[PDB]
């Protein structure tokens, strides 16, 4: 079936190989875990290098070979989509679970029991998390800024986590509407080198990095009537083949003047709708740009389809395919639409809209790769703040959850018994790697923190413990504002355990020629 | 993940390798440091060679392999963009910091403490620089020419640093407007081989290396009405397909005469606006060139888009896409627009404008590579003079700052304590390399100047010390006019320390296939 | 230091590599563990293949590469020398300890603590074994035959372990003298294909596979006077160079007859001492063989030096270098010395001696490789029976010891605390592999037997438990006669733990060119 040279894994080898794939990924990713986690340097085929700590960015960009690692990536991706955070967490515990899996396989625990114990412990872990979760005001200013900041930590951007929490909490509360469901597409992350991270600021509307196509156009329009076109404002040609046949030099001019009228009529139609701002996804004819300026219409051409959509969301402007199809009902409203140059580049600010459904975050900083790292940092901050509003429960950080999971799943193991209790016992053991490696990356003693934090959690409770890697000692994570959304950690374990078992489900690898 | 043959670095190897990358760059760049710094010979793939001392030019042109060096380059670039100078400085201290970093890593100082100490010492260094900074008149003729000259030194151009300081101080004061914000794009650096560096001179307006498209056109126009076109002055064709069908030899002529009228009408439209100078980004039809000359319009074709923009800035002329779109409001004013031949080549001088927002500096010299080196030298001079106006504080040179930083960050280290004080102590040690290598390149004793200058600075103060490599002994840098803008040195350390830590942030390099 | 191509291991790699070496050996050897342990097929460079279960035989014959495995072999060898048994046991727990060692190294337990915990737990294990040991009559017929048989089990020879126990217990009791110290060199293991294993029998004296050099000699001599010569019974030549110069054919005969007299005198000297049995390590002249037969002296030539020594031990015969050096005091006594042909081959039985200090065990069986396997099986049986007499304490088998060690060293770990308790806890975990793999090879469930046997041992005691792989369930090892000498298991753990730590002591491998 396999071509001479193609490698095949089966039984203990298929399981070891899949464990090796997930473990090697987890071995790489686990070093990014925690506030004191490190960075990875990813260099592509062209020489372009990106530095990050985000599990998803790392796994997507790197050139993975093992299919087992390719399935684990789906966890990191659905983590970013569903909750934003929990990337590193889910991958690390997944690789750890796989390490434990082979121990059990060798210790005479059948693979069908191992996958049973993991599914069982994860199902109990869902109940455990739902019952350990600490209820909090979904829109509480304080918890929102605490969730935001704690997500930001372990990244370079944390130097301004206070300004960023304020920005992201405001943005999410705006676009989330009710309490709630958030759409991350309504919050744009824009970045422009120059200034510092303290200068990063939220714009209640849409910021695009475009210019006014004519110098004759106003540089600022208030009470703006935004029209969105996706076609070019040029002389259209019909579908049916057609050519003009000039018989007179006056007739050559008869057409020239007709194209002048045409482009004027195109602008007159925009004007007729009541529009005075015009964003065209395609180009705008040089003559039409003059006509646009003549009618006091401010305009930008070649607008990114994504930018056209954000504008539609914020202003309520309607992207129209055909210019003829424009109507007054297609116009959006903005308080102010103004052309501004920041760090030399022209960008148009569409702000102060009536009821903006989309906002833009303008990130500043001393270097492109810094504001790039910041852009990733705040992307997660939006996610996790949205998670806290969508589900009004949060949990203590510093490994307090994973410690609760160890304590209670080890008790759960006892109820299960048989070889199935070793599978559950090993599941809990794997989940302990997070508390362990959170501090491992901080340079703290895995042994001391393991005993003292475990005892402190078990005795003092859940919202009255956890390990603080910042002081290098057990603290009160809840009092210190070190909390994350319930969704993050519940989805992290769920998906991580499921993909891990999935890897453990395969007993044979068949490669096509 | 990595293809067989691809190299991977992790832990101590990833850190050593990144230190080696930055150190090798710093080892190369540190030889350019100071008034007695040397030059680098950069030879490309085609054989074209450039000689320079500018850190940015060196790093951009050279073919860098290490991603760590690729991130350090961003410091050199943002240095040139933000402050102009501090290229060498930032790179050198960055590589030195990296050397110290591994010492600390081996000495049992955890990488998370090293990056903490550097960030901490740099944050204190910002306060130290803000408090050591010496207040000066932002527009003071003297400090402006002193900043200009001290930036110029260590370059071949310093032979005429007096004439260059006068030129650059005037140019910046003009375009900077208030006190202030300077746009370096408003000051053009033009160069033409011939004459000497003493012949370099400032033109209050825009100089372009173009000619008058017709010999029939005036060679000098006063009280000029400048029109800017970006399209060609030719017979346009419509978007819709069209062809002329001639049925008579008189009708062939009917069209020929219509194209004559057309191009005449195009010129008549320029004339109708009141224009008498015409810069076309595209070509001009031979017949239209005659019509332009007939109406007394001086014109140049194929003008660089950059040149069109500088003309718009200076004269207030408005670049118009379509000839039909021309209006009187699109005209700029210039006192004199005149065609002059210097060193054989034709160039048009647009000078003595009403309120020029852009100026041009015409550099002369005995060789192209000399006036090339001068062009780079004065580019920095513009930057740093702008820095002094933007922030009305300057600092003493001759390593006096870096010595203040050593003295006070070593005291700062004491307050920090733990292993964190070694990180801060090493940070200060790294910053000392500048005082050390400034004189290293001069051929002065690193040991003697280190003791005597340190004591002299600590005892006598900040604006009453520093090392003068020109006499090879401690002097009074402030009295001798050896000062640089606060912005240069503050941005230099900030970005250098941040990119250094960034390099220290990576613990693992992943290369894609 | 190392030649290009030579591999070098250090830190985590030196430790992993050494663990891999010991673990791979242990992974191979652990399959031989227990009554249901399997065999290994060792094929040399010449094609000669040996099948065995004995750890020493396996490790000596196989071509080991890793120096770590080369040090572990010393444990298996000193096991065979000191106690006979405990080969597999010591190697298995050694490799297991090494596996645990890296777990602890990764879990932030410093290698100096790991080696401390193992040394500490092994020192406590010595006390634990000395206190768990069950006192037994050193010469008790029953325990002696039980020790013998339990050692024999897991080998092919166990089919006749009853006859073999009787043979070995008698042999050891004879040569051990007091209670006691046994010399395994006093018990010879002879083997000859033919008959069955039931026909194996003990000869109270020495059996050699030699013949009577002359057909004229008696085939049986009673009340035998044994003389041992190591030189040949031939015409000696002097050290100083000398040659005979014959001047007459009568004189040629004068010498010929002198050599006849010489060899006669050599025999006459043997006769003069009172000897009537003669074993010559070297050859015997054909004429001298006749003279020996003439005097009624039975003789064998080219006797193995080992055979000459066993004869000296049993009979009290004294090996004499020079024939002239023979005296009456050099003679040994034997009840009967008789030439017998078994399976076609001639062998001389020297039996029924006055006070034999050496005995011979004649092994029979249907194939050479069977009686070869039996020879190895009974070699151990001699050792372990000697161990029980040398130290009058025995211990229950079926992993009962190792379970006691797990239970009490896990309690010991608690007293130790710190990271040192994990080292002791892991030491105990490693010692559990024996109970686990004893039944692993039987095809029993590692999980069920681990829980039920642990509880059964902890509750019921030490001499009232253990796992019986023969019924596949916990039993009473003591009641069922499944016991081994204290010496075996105490030496096994001691040496195994020491060599394991030794492997853990190395942090760097230096290979000479």
PDB file of N, CA and C in Angstrom, chain C residues 210-214 217-218 221 227 233 270 276-280 284 288-289 292-293 296-301 303 337 339 348:
ATOM      1  N   UNK C 210      38.439 -38.963  31.489  1.00  0.00           N
ATOM      2  CA  UNK C 210      39.734 -39.492  31.032  1.00  0.00           C
ATOM      3  C   UNK C 210      39.649 -41.024  30.923  1.00  0.00           C
ATOM      4  N   UNK C 211      40.707 -41.592  30.340  1.00  0.00           N
ATOM      5  CA  UNK C 211      40.827 -43.051  30.196  1.00  0.00           C
ATOM      6  C   UNK C 211      42.156 -43.532  30.790  1.00  0.00           C
ATOM      7  N   UNK C 212      42.225 -44.857  30.963  1.00  0.00           N
ATOM      8  CA  UNK C 212      43.456 -45.519  31.425  1.00  0.00           C
ATOM      9  C   UNK C 212      44.391 -45.645  30.216  1.00  0.00           C
ATOM     10  N   UNK C 213      45.557 -45.009  30.353  1.00  0.00           N
ATOM     11  CA  UNK C 213      46.549 -44.905  29.262  1.00  0.00           C
ATOM     12  C   UNK C 213      47.073 -46.244  28.709  1.00  0.00           C
ATOM     13  N   UNK C 214      46.989 -47.299  29.509  1.00  0.00           N
ATOM     14  CA  UNK C 214      47.296 -48.650  29.015  1.00  0.00           C
ATOM     15  C   UNK C 214      46.152 -49.622  29.305  1.00  0.00           C
ATOM     16  N   UNK C 217      46.515 -51.962  32.373  1.00  0.00           N
ATOM     17  CA  UNK C 217      46.246 -51.445  33.725  1.00  0.00           C
ATOM     18  C   UNK C 217      44.902 -51.965  34.261  1.00  0.00           C
ATOM     19  N   UNK C 218      44.824 -52.141  35.597  1.00  0.00           N
ATOM     20  CA  UNK C 218      43.552 -52.465  36.263  1.00  0.00           C
ATOM     21  C   UNK C 218      42.501 -51.431  35.863  1.00  0.00           C
ATOM     22  N   UNK C 221      40.520 -49.896  41.089  1.00  0.00           N
ATOM     23  CA  UNK C 221      41.467 -49.947  42.215  1.00  0.00           C
ATOM     24  C   UNK C 221      40.739 -49.424  43.460  1.00  0.00           C
ATOM     25  N   UNK C 227      48.411 -40.355  43.341  1.00  0.00           N
ATOM     26  CA  UNK C 227      49.532 -39.431  43.122  1.00  0.00           C
ATOM     27  C   UNK C 227      49.221 -38.520  41.928  1.00  0.00           C
ATOM     28  N   UNK C 233      55.771 -37.821  32.213  1.00  0.00           N
ATOM     29  CA  UNK C 233      56.607 -38.972  32.584  1.00  0.00           C
ATOM     30  C   UNK C 233      57.361 -39.497  31.343  1.00  0.00           C
ATOM     31  N   UNK C 270      57.242 -43.601  41.832  1.00  0.00           N
ATOM     32  CA  UNK C 270      55.796 -43.509  42.108  1.00  0.00           C
ATOM     33  C   UNK C 270      55.377 -44.691  42.989  1.00  0.00           C
ATOM     34  N   UNK C 276      49.296 -45.976  43.533  1.00  0.00           N
ATOM     35  CA  UNK C 276      48.768 -46.969  42.582  1.00  0.00           C
ATOM     36  C   UNK C 276      47.740 -46.371  41.602  1.00  0.00           C
ATOM     37  N   UNK C 277      47.493 -45.074  41.782  1.00  0.00           N
ATOM     38  CA  UNK C 277      46.735 -44.234  40.838  1.00  0.00           C
ATOM     39  C   UNK C 277      47.638 -43.041  40.497  1.00  0.00           C
ATOM     40  N   UNK C 278      47.674 -42.716  39.203  1.00  0.00           N
ATOM     41  CA  UNK C 278      48.542 -41.641  38.731  1.00  0.00           C
ATOM     42  C   UNK C 278      47.849 -40.788  37.661  1.00  0.00           C
ATOM     43  N   UNK C 279      47.697 -39.516  38.043  1.00  0.00           N
ATOM     44  CA  UNK C 279      47.147 -38.487  37.150  1.00  0.00           C
ATOM     45  C   UNK C 279      48.267 -37.507  36.795  1.00  0.00           C
ATOM     46  N   UNK C 280      48.585 -37.498  35.498  1.00  0.00           N
ATOM     47  CA  UNK C 280      49.653 -36.623  35.007  1.00  0.00           C
ATOM     48  C   UNK C 280      49.005 -35.507  34.167  1.00  0.00           C
ATOM     49  N   UNK C 284      52.486 -39.041  29.100  1.00  0.00           N
ATOM     50  CA  UNK C 284      53.194 -40.197  29.655  1.00  0.00           C
ATOM     51  C   UNK C 284      53.790 -40.979  28.479  1.00  0.00           C
ATOM     52  N   UNK C 288      56.841 -45.913  29.504  1.00  0.00           N
ATOM     53  CA  UNK C 288      56.504 -45.633  30.905  1.00  0.00           C
ATOM     54  C   UNK C 288      55.088 -46.103  31.262  1.00  0.00           C
ATOM     55  N   UNK C 289      54.184 -46.053  30.278  1.00  0.00           N
ATOM     56  CA  UNK C 289      52.789 -46.514  30.452  1.00  0.00           C
ATOM     57  C   UNK C 289      52.747 -48.021  30.711  1.00  0.00           C
ATOM     58  N   UNK C 292      54.151 -48.607  34.229  1.00  0.00           N
ATOM     59  CA  UNK C 292      53.068 -48.242  35.154  1.00  0.00           C
ATOM     60  C   UNK C 292      52.073 -49.393  35.350  1.00  0.00           C
ATOM     61  N   UNK C 293      51.718 -49.999  34.219  1.00  0.00           N
ATOM     62  CA  UNK C 293      50.875 -51.206  34.167  1.00  0.00           C
ATOM     63  C   UNK C 293      51.570 -52.410  34.808  1.00  0.00           C
ATOM     64  N   UNK C 296      51.191 -52.252  38.478  1.00  0.00           N
ATOM     65  CA  UNK C 296      49.756 -52.255  38.827  1.00  0.00           C
ATOM     66  C   UNK C 296      49.227 -50.837  39.083  1.00  0.00           C
ATOM     67  N   UNK C 297      49.891 -49.850  38.486  1.00  0.00           N
ATOM     68  CA  UNK C 297      49.522 -48.437  38.646  1.00  0.00           C
ATOM     69  C   UNK C 297      48.579 -48.101  37.487  1.00  0.00           C
ATOM     70  N   UNK C 298      47.409 -47.623  37.904  1.00  0.00           N
ATOM     71  CA  UNK C 298      46.452 -47.085  36.939  1.00  0.00           C
ATOM     72  C   UNK C 298      46.747 -45.596  36.736  1.00  0.00           C
ATOM     73  N   UNK C 299      46.667 -45.183  35.474  1.00  0.00           N
ATOM     74  CA  UNK C 299      47.164 -43.851  35.108  1.00  0.00           C
ATOM     75  C   UNK C 299      46.365 -43.231  33.958  1.00  0.00           C
ATOM     76  N   UNK C 300      46.299 -41.896  34.027  1.00  0.00           N
ATOM     77  CA  UNK C 300      45.716 -41.071  32.959  1.00  0.00           C
ATOM     78  C   UNK C 300      46.614 -39.842  32.746  1.00  0.00           C
ATOM     79  N   UNK C 301      46.758 -39.491  31.461  1.00  0.00           N
ATOM     80  CA  UNK C 301      47.654 -38.401  31.043  1.00  0.00           C
ATOM     81  C   UNK C 301      46.906 -37.221  30.417  1.00  0.00           C
ATOM     82  N   UNK C 303      45.855 -34.497  32.057  1.00  0.00           N
ATOM     83  CA  UNK C 303      44.723 -34.171  32.946  1.00  0.00           C
ATOM     84  C   UNK C 303      44.633 -32.644  33.078  1.00  0.00           C
ATOM     85  N   UNK C 337      38.670 -45.993  42.781  1.00  0.00           N
ATOM     86  CA  UNK C 337      39.028 -45.291  41.539  1.00  0.00           C
ATOM     87  C   UNK C 337      38.787 -46.293  40.409  1.00  0.00           C
ATOM     88  N   UNK C 339      37.450 -46.920  36.144  1.00  0.00           N
ATOM     89  CA  UNK C 339      37.212 -46.487  34.760  1.00  0.00           C
ATOM     90  C   UNK C 339      35.853 -47.032  34.287  1.00  0.00           C
ATOM     91  N   UNK C 348      36.834 -41.535  34.470  1.00  0.00           N
ATOM     92  CA  UNK C 348      37.289 -42.190  35.709  1.00  0.00           C
ATOM     93  C   UNK C 348      36.562 -41.552  36.902  1.00  0.00           C
TER      94      UNK C 348
END
